[PDB]
Design a protein around this ligand. Structure first.
Ligand code: 6WD
Length: 358
């Protein structure tokens, strides 16, 4: 796995990407690593924002599926033509697989002006693949066609990081891994059972923490929280940080600001009945440099999203083989001399199954 260390790059707020090759002869592309979606989709036309794009005409191994796909998001969209081709990861396992590829032929608010990636690698499950679950996601193809173990891990450093494909590199973390069950294989869905701001329980019905889901998503920058939870969390963060006052717009991410800030703890459902563990992040994770900073915790209508704000504190193991996600303190996380991100257990937490939304 030495070869896979430091195989991720990016720019702040623009996501983390890995080098891949598609086609025969191989075409090199930079591809966003996204645990929050399930399609392998790449620019296939000369959009002006793109450094490079997939040219199917140059690939002898390209196969047309003769189906199109339209993928709208809340703001923006991509549309593409489905096919298959041979795909490798130069700084990954020494293998080539035949994968589904959506050739992107038009988009809006999808590619970023100024970024260095030109496609997305959806690492989540078939249930959320577009157009439907018959379109086998890349990782499912990789595990089917090779001996690569059904696991990957991510160390996102606040940019660079590591995607260890088929394993765990113990040099990337300190202490022990602690595992939370994947509730359902669609998104990487998890259950949050308790929330603390500076060790102070938010005291909410834990179902609210997971309304309507809680997910782990490398393709999202922020820690996104259900609005009822966000309102409560902001109230507590405001109170803990009242040495200095800030405009109300800052907490809503409508404006920037230029030890006063509390830690944030999320208790996650453990592996055993009535057992949990907690992960703890610092302001160094949730106040993001733009010295100007954006408040990178925001409300959601789609549930909790544990984006880069959470993942940058931790080495995160997507243990698909055992339907569980592991967290350990990241050897690269940004901290200071007084506080560090933490993963701690075990704790006693009752009625954890009541926390999941149905
Ligand atoms: C595919 C997606 C995504 C990530 C990064 C990006 F640069 C462009 C993207 F399209 C969709 C994003 C999204 C936007 N709006 C409503 N829902 C999801 S979040 C995610 N993890 N992956």
């Amino acid at each position: 796995f030495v070869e896979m260390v430091d195989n991720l790059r990016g720019k702040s707020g623009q996501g983390y990407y890995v080098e891949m090759t598609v086609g025969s002869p191989p075409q090199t592309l930079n591809i966003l690593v996204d645990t929050g979606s399930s399609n392998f989709a790449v620019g296939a036309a000369p959009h002006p924002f793109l450094h490079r794009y997939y040219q199917r005409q140059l690939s002898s191994t390209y196969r047309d599926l003769r189906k199109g796909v339209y993928v709208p998001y809340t703001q923006g969209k991509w549309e593409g033509e489905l096919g298959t081709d041979l795909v490798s990861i130069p700084h990954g396992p020494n293998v080539t697989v035949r994968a589904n590829i959506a050739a992107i032929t038009e988009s809006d608010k999808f590619f970023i002006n100024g970024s260095n990636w030109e496609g997305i690698l959806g690492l989540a499950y078939a249930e959320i693949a577009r157009p439907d679950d018959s379109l086998e996601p890349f990782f499912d193809s990789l595990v089917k066609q090779t001996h690569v173990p059904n696991l990957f891990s991510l160390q996102l450093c606040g940019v660079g990081g590591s995607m260890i494909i088929g394993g765990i590199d113990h040099s990337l973390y300190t202490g022990s891994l602690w595992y939370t069950p994947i509730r359902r294989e669609w998104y990487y869905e998890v259950i949050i059972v308790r929330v603390e701001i500076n060790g102070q329980d938010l005291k909410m019905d834990c179902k609210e923490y997971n309304y309507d889901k809680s997910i782990v998503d490398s393709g999202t920058t922020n820690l996104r929280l259900p609005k009822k939870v966000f309102e409560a969390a902001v109230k507590s963060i405001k109170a803990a940080s009242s040495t200095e006052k800030f405009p109300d717009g800052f907490w809503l991410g409508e404006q920037l600001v230029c030890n006063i800030f509390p830690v944030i703890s999320l208790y996650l459902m453990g592996e055993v009945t009535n057992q949990s563990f907690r992960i703890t992040i610092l302001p160094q994770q949730y106040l993001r440099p733009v010295d100007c900073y954006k408040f990178a915790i925001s409300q959601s209508s789609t549930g909790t999203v544990m984006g880069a704000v959470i993942m940058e504190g931790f080495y995160v193991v997507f243990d698909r083989a055992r339907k569980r996600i592991g967290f350990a303190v990241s050897a690269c996380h940004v901290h200071d001399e007084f506080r560090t991100a933490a993963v701690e257990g075990p704790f006693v937490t009752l009625d954890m199954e009541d926390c999941g939304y149905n």
